[PDB]
Design an enzyme around this catalytic site. Structure first.
Site, PDB file in Angstrom:
ATOM      1  N   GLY A 177       0.841  -1.113   0.080  1.00 24.94           N
ATOM      2  CA  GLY A 177      -0.167   0.052   0.016  1.00 24.94           C
ATOM      3  C   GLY A 177       0.917   1.347   0.166  1.00 24.94           C
ATOM      4  O   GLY A 177      -0.037   2.449   0.007  1.00 24.94           O
ATOM      5  N   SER A 178       2.152   1.195   0.185  1.00 25.96           N
ATOM      6  CA  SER A 178       3.114   2.304   0.158  1.00 25.96           C
ATOM      7  C   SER A 178       2.872   3.290   1.184  1.00 25.96           C
ATOM      8  O   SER A 178       3.485   4.303   1.354  1.00 25.96           O
ATOM      9  CB  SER A 178       2.872   3.180  -1.279  1.00 25.96           C
ATOM     10  OG  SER A 178       1.531   3.853  -1.094  1.00 25.96           O
TER      11      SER A 178
ATOM     12  N   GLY B 268      -1.399   3.508   6.406  1.00 27.88           N
ATOM     13  CA  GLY B 268      -0.750   2.945   7.517  1.00 27.88           C
ATOM     14  C   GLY B 268       0.509   2.279   7.331  1.00 27.88           C
ATOM     15  O   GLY B 268       0.560   1.908   6.184  1.00 27.88           O
TER      16      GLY B 268
ATOM     17  N   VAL C 182       1.685  -1.276   6.915  1.00 28.53           N
ATOM     18  CA  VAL C 182       1.254  -2.684   6.701  1.00 28.53           C
ATOM     19  C   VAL C 182       2.260  -3.490   6.003  1.00 28.53           C
ATOM     20  O   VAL C 182       2.708  -2.679   5.038  1.00 28.53           O
ATOM     21  CB  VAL C 182      -0.253  -2.660   5.889  1.00 28.53           C
ATOM     22  CG1 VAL C 182      -0.858  -4.157   5.983  1.00 28.53           C
ATOM     23  CG2 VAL C 182      -1.098  -1.662   6.682  1.00 28.53           C
TER      24      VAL C 182
ATOM     25  N   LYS D  16      -0.438  -5.174  10.651  1.00 24.42           N
ATOM     26  CA  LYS D  16      -0.388  -3.791  10.624  1.00 24.42           C
ATOM     27  C   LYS D  16       0.282  -3.359  11.967  1.00 24.42           C
ATOM     28  O   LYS D  16      -0.209  -3.887  12.951  1.00 24.42           O
ATOM     29  CB  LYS D  16      -2.011  -3.239  10.642  1.00 24.42           C
ATOM     30  CG  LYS D  16      -1.956  -1.804  10.673  1.00 24.42           C
ATOM     31  CD  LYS D  16      -3.399  -1.253  11.306  1.00 24.42           C
ATOM     32  CE  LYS D  16      -4.441  -1.792  11.033  1.00 24.42           C
ATOM     33  NZ  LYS D  16      -5.764  -1.016  11.493  1.00 24.42           N
TER      34      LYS D  16
ATOM     35  N   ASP E 135     -12.810  -3.021   8.708  1.00 30.15           N
ATOM     36  CA  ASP E 135     -13.363  -1.880   9.200  1.00 30.15           C
ATOM     37  C   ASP E 135     -14.637  -1.694  10.105  1.00 30.15           C
ATOM     38  O   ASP E 135     -15.175  -0.597   9.975  1.00 30.15           O
ATOM     39  CB  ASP E 135     -13.150  -0.791   8.004  1.00 30.15           C
ATOM     40  CG  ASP E 135     -12.011  -0.018   8.273  1.00 30.15           C
ATOM     41  OD1 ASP E 135     -11.793   1.100   9.085  1.00 30.15           O
ATOM     42  OD2 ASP E 135     -11.272  -0.097   7.225  1.00 30.15           O
TER      43      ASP E 135
END
Ligand SMILES: O=C1c2ccccc2C(=O)N1CCCN(c1ccc(=O)n(-c2ccccc2Cl)n1)c1ccc(F)cc1Cl
Length: 349
Positions: free
Chosen positions: A28-29, A33, A35, A50, A165
């Site tokens: 996810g760069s 957050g 990860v 995470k 989420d």
């Protein structure tokens, strides 16, 4: 029985984890957050990890850290993201200042994979069936997701799905403004705060998601709250007298009444060519009055899911105690509660 931990720096961030976790690699760069993807040599499972850094920088953050840990620890269901492990390199409460959350690696979200694409009916059946199966479980625990959308549905290469989420809804007003997916899947009663909402808000979201998988098109892509409300009422009709009374917000109710009344449209003419059972289910999920929407438990028994439904394999959860939400505690008290939850974690069987 504390494992041995090793350290490594990934994209300017230090990761200190148990030896069992190998092959750590960033994902996810950073937009979501810290990860990493990793391989759990002890279970043979590919995992997503995470790292929450300085989770106790303020009362608000400390409480959020506790909330997320409590929610993730409660969920044990195939279609809901849950915890394979949670750990901290800290040996005591004093040095405790980081929390690592380990889950199954799915590798993609539904939005990233199917946006703009019309899926086959059998594929929609499988995807919506799993969402509802996981939602039935979440709702049975008295937890409301509140922000279901494609980007919150983790899916793997075989279209297996896990909901992400749930229960964490901290979207700023600015993030909900304009032509944004953060608002397109929201039930109207919550978008405009019409009344104290409940779990029925999530069924509306599933309806929005289902329609989009069936057509390849966002169902209510509003340019703003008002435009979106107009898009919604054009499809499902303006509120009737009975629903107007349930709108406890006097201002909201008075605005709704200023609109020209419109009748609910024929969904067969909107979703042309779709499976009649999908059209019927959509009509039952997309009801303006939330009291009348089908529930996740009832939807699983709907004919549309005949090929997947199994009443002996759609488990419910234990009740989730969220009494902590009503308490105001100090940073250190939230931190100690979080530490207790971390050290008391018991690995899945
Ligand atoms: O919420 C998103 C998201 C949505 C869409 C695309 C990418 C991302 C992303 O990195 N995040 C943040 C991570 C969200 N989490 C998970 C768990 C498993 C999982 O396959 N993914 C995930 C989803 C999409 C793309 C890559 C990954 Cl790795 N994400 C997660 C939840 C709870 C927990 F305790 C630990 C972890 Cl690692």
């Amino acid at each position: 029985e504390r494992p041995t931990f090793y350290r490594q720096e990934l994209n300017k961030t230090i990761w200190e984890v148990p030896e069992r976790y190998q092959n750590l690699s960033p994902v996810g760069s950073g937009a979501y957050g810290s990860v990493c993807a990793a391989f759990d040599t002890k279970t043979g499972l590919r995992v997503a990890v995470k790292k929450l850094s300085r989770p106790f920088q303020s009362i608000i953050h400390a409480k959020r850290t506790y909330r997320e840990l409590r929610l993730l620890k409660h969920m044990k269901h195939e279609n809901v993201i849950g915890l394979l492990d949670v750990f901290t390199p800290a040996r005591s409460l004093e040095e405790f200042n980081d929390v690592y959350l380990v889950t199954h690696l799915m590798g993609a979200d539904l939005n990233n994979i199917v946006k703009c694409q019309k899926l086959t009916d059998d594929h929609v059946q499988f995807l919506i069936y799993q969402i509802l199966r996981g939602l039935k479980y979440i709702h049975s625990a008295d937890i409301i997701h509140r922000d279901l959308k494609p980007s919150n549905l983790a899916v793997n290469e075989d279209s297996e799905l896990k909901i992400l989420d749930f229960g964490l809804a901290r979207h700023t007003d600015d993030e909900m403004t304009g032509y944004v997916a953060t608002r397109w899947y929201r039930a109207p009663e919550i978008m405009l705060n019409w009344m104290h909402y409940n779990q029925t808000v999530d069924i509306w979201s599933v309806g929005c998601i289902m329609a989009e998988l069936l057509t390849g098109r966002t169902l209510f892509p509003g340019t703003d709250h008002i435009d979106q409300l107009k898009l919604i009422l054009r499809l499902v009709g303006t509120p009737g007298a009975e629903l107007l009374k349930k709108i406890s917000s006097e201002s909201a109710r008075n605005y709704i009444q200023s609109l020209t009344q419109m009748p609910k449209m024929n969904f067969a003419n909107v979703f042309i060519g779709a499976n009649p059972l999908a059209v019927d289910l959509l009509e039952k999920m997309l009801v303006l009055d939330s009291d009348k929407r089908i529930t996740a438990a009832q939807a699983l028994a709907h004919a549309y899911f005949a090929q997947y439904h199994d009443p002996d394999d759609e488990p419910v959860a234990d009740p989730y105690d969220q009494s902590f939400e009503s308490r105001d505690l100090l940073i250190d008290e939230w931190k100690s509660l979080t530490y207790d939850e971390v050290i008391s974690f018991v690995p899945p069987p």
